[PDB]
From a paper:
Thogotoviruses, exemplified by Thogoto virus (THOV), are capable of infecting humans using ticks as vectors. Numbered by size, segments 1, 2 and 3 encode the PB2, PB1 and PA subunits respectively to constitute the THOV polymerase. Although the 3 polymerase subunits show low sequence identities to their influenza counterparts (∼15%, ∼27% and ∼19% to IAV PB2, PB1 and PA, respectively), THOVPol exhibits similarity in overall architecture to influenza virus polymerases (FluPols). Here, we report a series of THOV polymerase cryo-EM structures with resolutions from 2.3 to 3.2 Å to reveal the initiation and elongation processes of THOV RNA synthesis.
To further understand THOVPol RNA transcription, we prepared a transcriptional elongation sample by primer-extension of m7GpppAmG, a dinucleotide primer with a cap-1 structure. Cryo-EM imaging of this sample identified THOVPol in two monomeric conformations and one asymmetric dimer conformation. The asymmetric dimer is essentially formed by the association of THOVPol-EL and THOVPol-RE, representing an “elongation-reception” conformation. The ordering of the PB2 627 domain likely facilitates the recruitment of a THOVPol-RE molecule to form the asymmetric dimer. The PA putative endonuclease domain is resolved in the monomeric form of THOVPol-RE but invisible in THOVPol-RE of an asymmetric dimer. The narrow but long dimer interface is formed by the THOVPol-EL PB2 subunit and the THOVPol-RE PA N-terminal domain. The THOVPol structures therefore are the first to confirm that one polymerase functions to synthesize RNA, while the other polymerase functions to receive the RNA product in the asymmetric dimer. Our structural analysis also shows that RNA elongation alone in THOVPol can trigger the re-configuration of the peripheral domains to facilitate the assembly of the asymmetric dimer.
Residue numbers in the entry:
A (entry chain C): 8 to 755
B (entry chain A): 2 to 52
C (entry chain A): 157 to 622
D (entry chain B): 1 to 180, 209 to 638, 645 to 710
Write the structure that this text describes.
Amino acid sequence: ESECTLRALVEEYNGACKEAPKEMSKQFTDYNTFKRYTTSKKDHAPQMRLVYSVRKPWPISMTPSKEIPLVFNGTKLKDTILDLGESKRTRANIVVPDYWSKYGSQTSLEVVNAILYAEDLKVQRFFSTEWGEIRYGRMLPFRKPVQACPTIEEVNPASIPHTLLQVFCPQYTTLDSKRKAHMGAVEKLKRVMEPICKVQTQESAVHIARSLIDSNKKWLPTVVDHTPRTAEMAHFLCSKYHYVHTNTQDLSDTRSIDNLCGELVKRSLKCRCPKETLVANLDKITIQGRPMREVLADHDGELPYLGICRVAMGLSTHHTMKIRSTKFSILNSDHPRIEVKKVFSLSPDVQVTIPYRRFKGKAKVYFQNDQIQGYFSCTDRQIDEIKISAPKNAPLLEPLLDICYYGSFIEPGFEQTFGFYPAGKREFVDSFFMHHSKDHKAFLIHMGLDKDLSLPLSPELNWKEPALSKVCRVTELDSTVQPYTSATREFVLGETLNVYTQHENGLELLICPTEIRSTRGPLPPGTNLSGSEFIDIYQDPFSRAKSLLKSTILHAERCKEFVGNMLEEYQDPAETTVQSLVPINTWGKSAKRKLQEEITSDPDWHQCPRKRAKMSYLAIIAGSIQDRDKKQTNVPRAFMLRGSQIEYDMKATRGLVVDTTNRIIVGGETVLREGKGGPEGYVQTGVFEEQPRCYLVDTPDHGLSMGLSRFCVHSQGRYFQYEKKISIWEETDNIKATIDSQRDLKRR
Amino acid sequence: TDRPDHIDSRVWELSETQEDWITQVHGHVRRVVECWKYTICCLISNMHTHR
Amino acid sequence: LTQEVVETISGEAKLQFSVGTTFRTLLKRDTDWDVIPTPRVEPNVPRIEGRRWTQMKKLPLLKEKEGPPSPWRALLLGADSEYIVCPPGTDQEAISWIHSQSEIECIRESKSTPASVITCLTSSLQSFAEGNPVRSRIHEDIIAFGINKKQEKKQSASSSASGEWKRAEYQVEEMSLPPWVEEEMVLLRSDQEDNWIELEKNAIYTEVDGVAEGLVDKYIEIVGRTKVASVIEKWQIAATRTFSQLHTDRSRITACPIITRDPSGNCQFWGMVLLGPHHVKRDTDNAPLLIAEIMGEDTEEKYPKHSVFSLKVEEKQFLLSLKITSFSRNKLYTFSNIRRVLIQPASIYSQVVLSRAAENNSLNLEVNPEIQLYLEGAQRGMTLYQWVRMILCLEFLMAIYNNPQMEGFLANMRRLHMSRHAMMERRQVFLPFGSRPEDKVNECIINNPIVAYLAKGWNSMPNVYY
Amino acid sequence: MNLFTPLSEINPTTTQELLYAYTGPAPVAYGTRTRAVLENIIRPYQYFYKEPNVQRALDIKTGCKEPEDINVEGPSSGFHTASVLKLADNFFRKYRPAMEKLKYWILVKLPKLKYAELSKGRQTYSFIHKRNLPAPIALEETVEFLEQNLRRKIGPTLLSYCQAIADVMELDETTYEGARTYTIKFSREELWDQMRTLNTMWKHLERGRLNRRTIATPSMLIRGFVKIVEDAAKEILENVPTSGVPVGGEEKLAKLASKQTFHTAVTGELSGDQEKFNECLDPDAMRLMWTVFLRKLGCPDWIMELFNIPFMVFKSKLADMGEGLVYTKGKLTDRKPLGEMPSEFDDLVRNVVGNSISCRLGMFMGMYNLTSTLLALISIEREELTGSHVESSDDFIHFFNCKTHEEMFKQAETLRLTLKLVGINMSPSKCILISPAGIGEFNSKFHHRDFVGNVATELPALVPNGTNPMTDLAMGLNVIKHSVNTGQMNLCTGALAMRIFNHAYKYAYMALGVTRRTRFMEENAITPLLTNQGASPVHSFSTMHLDEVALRRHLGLLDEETLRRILNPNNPVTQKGDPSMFFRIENKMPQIMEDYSVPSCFKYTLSRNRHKALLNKEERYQRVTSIINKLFPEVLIQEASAPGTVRESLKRRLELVVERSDLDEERKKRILSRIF
RNA sequence: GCAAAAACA
RNA sequence: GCCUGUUUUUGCU
RNA sequence: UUGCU
RNA sequence: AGAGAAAUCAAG
Ligand SMILES: *O[C]1[C]([C]OP([O])(=O)OP([O])(=O)OP([O])(=O)O[C][C]2O[C](N3=[C]N([C])C4=C3N=C([N])[N]C4=O)[C]([O])[C]2[O])O[C](N2[C]=NC3=C2N=[C]N=C3[N])[C]1O[C]
């Protein structure tokens, strides 16, 4: 039972106090130092003694036991005669493990499964990837950091210690640690380690848990666009002389997060100062139960919109400049890529402008596309040298044209007009590519021809192809060239959500919206856009109405603002949602009048959630798309959402909102539970070294559910008594308001 | 980075160029304390209007 | 951070570090500046007249030392090693068979190893005939293992001591390249009946595994049936058997027979190693050994310290080495893992085959291209298989002859190798003012026969590239 | 050599791996180190002047010399003060992000450095016992010395440790009183001598050099001071393009490949070493460079003083001479100190302090690899040099992109002269410049078109260790796997190394031939079923990373009948001598303590044949740490922050956990009754 | 964090 | 006997 | 006691 | 004797 464990702990504490009168009068924090004193575990060289050690008469040291017989068939197993009883004293032959492999006590099968679980994952992962065909090509290595082993979940490092504490020791955690932990990873780890912790010690179990949810990236040479996104099978799938063509989908939610970030960026650019708008929204949107900042910190991807949102939160990004299929990286340059605001006015009064970018000074840019890779050195707009490594007879049209577009070296399409007046940037760039696809003579006239036949580039852009003349200043790559950055880059998020890289003589553009092309994709599961200002992102009318109602009901100030903006035709951040939820009708003025009676009769309405629900219902009907022809009629008790059979009710007796005296449920989820679990959260309110006069809950969970107004939690000998939150606003909103007022007062 | 979790990002950014923390005793702790004072000032002036 | 926060709140603000008065005086004793130096000189970088970089038009010529030819200074014989075929059984049975059917006759006696110690070996045989690898001391052991030799030498030196104290001034004798190195290279490569490399094949699950094991099998069958493999097996067996008997203190004589086994099961007697009274306190100190082993051919200039005996067994004649040596624990442990020397020639072979496969985008696994090499001062073609074969021969020869001279020579030869490789590609090599890259190599060429062999090989090839 | 120079298929660079005599014995040092130590002491004095004048160069303190004093045709010990100032100014003006990172490290990372990091070191000289002791032992004895001499408690931070070291030097006398019983006393001068004392010893088993070299180590009284400087130097070096020391493995190769750009008309590559390094660098130059760095950053005076302590201490370094130069009368070999009879080191007799010798010039040791790297890098920054430089400690590689050959020659000579302006001398015999770039060497890594693999740098690790069969197998397979991934060994070499390691591993555990283990297994019908038991190998080339037991179970080679036996958590073979604690996920009692065994029966321990009292003190520390870990699982994931002393904290935690045991009241009272 | 092993400077 | 720095591979707390 | 091709 | 290479081992 638990009683024996308590006896053991008490006896161990008594022994430590008695055997070590010192070493315990020290501070507890001193454990951070004297835990590092682990001498006497040192041996000279075990590799130079193994052969002799195995062949000693009694090599194996083990604790005394009766399971191993003193003398087995013929042979004597254990040397239990000399000093039996001195801890790890008994000495046994090298054959004792062999004797135990047979003729030994067995164990239940679930224990064996639990012991081998971590290794069985690797075994089936190896015997599950489709083994392709070996291709030999004399690979040119690309040295990059890759993740050592796959993870069950992606958790940012700062959240690793809090996640594990939520799995093994919830009873010694605070609500801040609970909020900083990844609860999906917590649940997965609990399910995984429930059998594992029965056969593994505390430190071992922590080790396997962290190894399951840590990245531990290491530098390895991989092959371009063939990385197995994990070093687990790198020794098998690539050996500098071959690769095994393997097929594997993304198997991740990074694309969905990119879709969400792209929607947020696109909708943020349509308002004043998009940067502050995006930063404010990202601090109020949550995916599952995790805030958007932490999930952005979790997914450090290669995608543009994800990089923009990570930079907006103060994080870094790994995005690189990419033109269609070719990726570019500036090895070094004298000055950043200067923008040119070249105007191609269609008329003296009507003007259309197509800004572009170029190099001012000397620059060197590495490029790669498919198996082709190399670099080019240029001065201003004149190309100086090109080094290329590519398979023989490969077509080098698209990489060279991507280089030309990146540097604006070629000017049938830069500094001048093709012909008929371009419609816009999209059409102009497409015309550039389609014209230069069939006309590559611009490259030839740009860098001339050479009479030397050793140059590998053919005039028709084929690598190492015999011809009459060869393209000058394009040669095979001498030594391996790869982009490396020494100082950690810090990114600047400028207006229009432009992600710049801090170059010495200015700012280097890295990501620029308005030319990022990506179709709309599914949102991440569990996305909760009920924060503010962005609800139309949801395509489903169900969730679109649910988020709006959750915003209105759970916040009295939001309900007041919504009613005020929806009654007097003010600017409401959710006008599109209201228009798309209610069909064309003639109930506007009637609903507005009803709002009038219910605001005049009870001006104190915005504290009863039932009143908030009724007011929100009337306001949503009031600002619907009013029909032009039909006359106004009385507001119906209940109506129907657009393109769905979902019924919305005034009294909330049925349909989307159900408000029973015990609780209010919106969209099948209990938004309000009367009596326990108030709408507003908790604040820490006190740290003490002694038990406060409150109720000590077992864990952060089993708290926040009883709805107590005073409860303490324990953490490293300290007590934290969370009480309640009574302020209607939030610290982030308070700071934002104060800073906005200060900046406005500075400007005014 | 060096920002404590409880300190808001905007407050941390605003406090970088307010005092020369390198020459002060416990410059990081002094900056954190100044951020505490500024956050207290923000919490005192929270959505309160008079005229 | 509670203490720091409370300190900042209170405002006492201790500077977190301060140097006192007397400590500052102690610090400023051996410097012309204060704790924080404030020189009164204007920051400026002057212009210094420097020298001129000179092109290395021709590769340096490594000097060859002059003196008596170097003897075979190694633990075992090498290419001269032979074995005796014995009926299948244990080591004790094989030794009992040999001892009861053997006649020993001295045919060449060396002053370094007196012939009278032969009895020791026979005594050890007797001891190992009845299963006692450890035997009591006999008189001749004192001569064989140098028992109490240090004390006797100290007394003799004290008796003969005269003059005035002077510094050490040690001298290392310089010896020339011996003729037997080329014979060792030519030998040690002849084909053998058995494979002599029997390594358990790894599992095969994927096609990558299949091609890897195919390459390994090809390498094994091109370097297996070679005298190098047999000598490597002999060296590894002897090193392990002698090492396993050295993790203790003994005042008696231990026998460590060198016996291998063929696939047919018959024992192969390469020799025996006798470990004398050893009380090792460190891993680098020497222990006495008496190495008896079978020769194939006797050379006076190659084995001056070996006392050759004629051994008659079942109407068969053999030769016996029986040299006195002192050898260390670390060296024995290193030679216990001498099988690792096969990797480097395998590295060359695998690199050639895989480069050809990548060039043709398909694996052949049977390519034997024509490597161009400077053979006798002229560039001639040569098959890859025998190139790998004597690369293995030379790698083994260097591994057993690794000393500080060899380490320094090989470490400093890499720059010259890179310079030669650069100049064969029409690349010019430029050097600083006082640049003599050959001196750092020449200082390591003293008496090591294989260092001299490598130096001669370097000198033979052309030094000027057009 | 002709066998190592192919001309048709592969280039000589790929045969650089054949110029390695490894798998043979490594040279060792045998006798007295005094000669080597005295040579290292006398070399800095011989290079200060163009002509060798040791006597005139022995009375100088700061090795600053005029530009015309600097020797251009040989090693030059010393620096130019104005050159160092200007070059540090130029290095600070450039690489501003590195200086911002330095400021962040000073503000943030520096105050949180813990002196327990000093425990990470190796054999350290002890000023108490005058002997080399393990780093934890020396750290603990020094901490106790400071505790009982200053009559206060040292904070866990390294700044508090350095302040304690500074304070203890103010006292006239100090006492240790170890009480293993024994009491020793120190004066200010004695403690000063002990702090600035470097114990010297031979470096054994070192490959690649003809002559044995001597290594040194100081006491814990200055290691802490050097630790801050090393951390700051690492922080600066991680953010500068020209550094090569803080990056290693594949990252260093990627950084090198980033600079192998050859586009101009003339593209040369110079690979070389620095001669007489670690003895031509004056620590005063490092003081000046660090002072400039911290002064342009606006740092206060205490930062400057702290950064200057270690170099000032090493300016007064007392290198411990060995046990005496060897002298011979006839065949005798006696051993005498330096001053007894004349030798080639007579001029240094005036510098003998006891059994040690003082050395003002040079640095004699490699405690400032990072700082010496920074000192090398600051000299690079000038308008004349336009190439790309990489410097780790004393191995450098430079890439010149020049229009004309004479411009490249001028740039190379300027590079040499700037290195000489600081106290770093290019080794003329070890510096090779190839005027068409593409072939080069750096840190024993050779490149022609790509960094070629270096076999024989991985063979010394291809030996089983002495832990247990499973650990040995895992370590060998993973070492071979890393070698394959790095590119040192390819498919065939990887598989051959696997087979050789498998054969050695089977032999080492009596799994080949007819042994006692094999006879026992055969006479009892015990089929092997495992690699260490002589069964056929289960690991393939592609299964390097897979565990043996799991793979055999998956392939069916290991039935559940034997799996339930070998993986028994109660087997007597690997049963621990003490009960252990276990978590319980979603259970009423999340803490269960019981007897445990290592699951695999083949993960046993090998018996061993049969600072003394400090070992008992450390055993007491082990006991306290074990009880803390059992009672405080949360510090198992995060740092310890519980208030109060250890005794009171564990008492309160024990009362709390018993209170949450869900047992009845009487159980709880009689349990808390017996707590001491 | 600790222990062992290896490589490089 | 077995320094410092960097990197890497294991296992244990 | 002693068996690596 | 020998191993060995800038000085040691060859036991008490
Ligand atoms: O140095 C080292 C560190 C590093 O690592 P990372 O990555 O950072 O992670 P982490 O751990 O989290 O960090 P920190 O925070 O600093 O720490 C924490 C804490 O807790 C402990 N631990 C941890 N872990 C993991 C562990 C522990 N313990 C035991 N017994 N086991 C385990 O596992 C520590 O100590 C602290 O206090 O970190 C650390 N580490 C890492 N790893 C490890 C460690 N330690 C120990 N062990 C291990 N295994 C170190 O420092 C401290």
